[PDB]
A paper describes a structure:
To combat these defenses, Anopheles mosquitoes produce inhibitors belonging to the SG7 protein family that block complement at the alternative C3 convertase, C3bBb. Crystal structures of albicin and SG7.AF reveal a novel four-helix bundle arrangement that is stabilized by an N-terminal hydrogen bonding network. In this study, we describe the structures of albicin and its orthologs SG7.AF (from An. freeborni) and anophensin (from An. stephensi), characterize the binding and mechanism of AP inhibition by these inhibitors, and determine a role for properdin in modulating the inhibitory activity of SG7.AF. SG7 family members are quite similar to one another structurally, but amino acid sequence divergence suggests that specific side chain interactions are key determinants for the observed differences in target affinity.
Anophensin, the albicin ortholog from An. stephensi, has been shown to inhibit the contact pathway of coagulation through binding with factor XIIa and high-molecular-weight kininogen (29). We evaluated the AP inhibitory activity of recombinant anophensin in the erythrocyte lysis assay and found it to be much less potent than albicin or SG7.AF with an IC50 value of approximately 350 nM in NHS and 6 μM in PDS. We obtained crystals of a variant of anophensin containing three additional amino acids at its N-terminus. This variant exhibits a reduced retention volume in gel filtration chromatography suggesting oligomerization. The structure was then determined experimentally using a selenomethionine derivative and found to be significantly rearranged in that helix α1 is moved away from the rest of the helical bundle and forms part of a single extended alpha helical structure running from the N-terminus to the C-terminal end of α2. This presumably occurs due to loss of the stabilizing effect of the N-terminal hydrogen bonding network described above as a result of lengthening of the peptide and changing the position of the free N-terminal amino group. In the crystal, anophensin occurs as a symmetrical dimer in a domain-swapped arrangement where a number of the amino acid interactions in albicin between α1 and the rest of the bundle are retained but are now intermolecular. The extended coil region linking α1 and α2 also becomes helical, creating several new intermolecular interactions that may stabilize a dimeric form of the protein in solution. Dimerization in solution may account for the decreased gel filtration retention volume and reduced activity of this variant. Nevertheless, the anophensin structure with its extended N-terminus suggests that the α1-α2 region of the 30 kDa family might be unable to form the N-terminal hydrogen bonding network seen in albicin and SG7.AF and possibly assume a partially unfolded structure that could be relevant for the interaction with collagen.
Numbering used by the authors:
A (entry chain A): 2 to 119
B (entry chain B): 3 to 120
Amino acid sequence: EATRKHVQQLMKVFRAIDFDFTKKAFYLHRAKYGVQNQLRNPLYLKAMSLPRSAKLSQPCLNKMIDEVNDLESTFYAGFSFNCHDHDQYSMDCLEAAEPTYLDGLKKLAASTEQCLVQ
Amino acid sequence: ATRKHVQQLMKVFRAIDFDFTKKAFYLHRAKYGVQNQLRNPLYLKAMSLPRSAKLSQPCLNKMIDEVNDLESTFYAGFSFNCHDHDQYSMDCLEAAEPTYLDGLKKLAASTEQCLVQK
């Protein structure tokens, strides 16, 4: 029996939902590699060029972690429900929210560098 | 020479990595939620329709919107609306996921009553 037209229309709606989940997984991937590139890697540089007798400020690592969380929450809000004038999870929402997030991690990597030793 | 500070920084960035993996596991659970409670039942419902049956597009749109609202609410329950446990734990997951599954199975039934345009 030929594939019913309405089966194809039903599956069309579910394709777009599956793709919605894909777009969300792309968001996560960008957010993770944002952290690696703007934050982890430059701070790995600072750590290796340090005197054997240096103590690390864990209040500073604590501020960084919670500041990672707030930047990432704000990135997901920009990608999703807080996208000022775009479809739900578009690439156009990412284009607006990602630079803010990466510039946030960049600034955070600088202030973390400054409080790292003590 | 200074293996100590580097290992100490990796510990913090290891955890952020795993946090991203917990968020990806959430997303897979939400995906297989839609497949099991919504997609698979609605496909059976459709193959039992008369072959001529035409679908109601407004019904399908109500279904996509409600999937996003339900998943928006699941993720909130996974994070900032958890309160009683830490921000992306399995505990937060296990508390909010039945409500999400229950909501999808409800939407599987409300969509069935409107699926055919008669």
